[PDB]
Amino acid sequence: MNIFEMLRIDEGLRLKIYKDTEGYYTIGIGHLLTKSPSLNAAKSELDKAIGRNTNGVITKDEAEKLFNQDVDAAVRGILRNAKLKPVYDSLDAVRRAALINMVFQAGETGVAGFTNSLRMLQQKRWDEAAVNLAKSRWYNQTPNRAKRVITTFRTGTWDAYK
């Protein structure tokens, strides 16, 4: 198990424009296109991301390419974040993957805002961080996914994904 397979599990794969759980325009493996209500604005962002007139549909390869870029961006965003880098450097390899997963889903600002939980993670107080991470909109809106992420932080194994 690694970050790519983990996220592929949590986000799925769709070759056609679709709405995420919040109702936003998305494509591929969780690649948010836009937060605007317009399908057209979405088609436009897609074409621009792919580099061609797509018509709301992409190939598997295209999807995997967006995916690789987004995982890369997530990691780099963590290292560039003053609040995130420290937690991340403190963690083992599995737990690091759980951090990247939250980041990829909720944006860096998003995560950087879980102040108390980040502190708990850094202190290695697993069980407490889990409880604290659960008191969030993030958990309430996508509970089964959040649950997987949280177990990963709690245990340090890939058990929730196996």
Ligand SMILES: [Cl-]
């Ligand atoms: Cl892009």
Ligand SMILES: [Cl-]
């Ligand atoms: Cl869920």
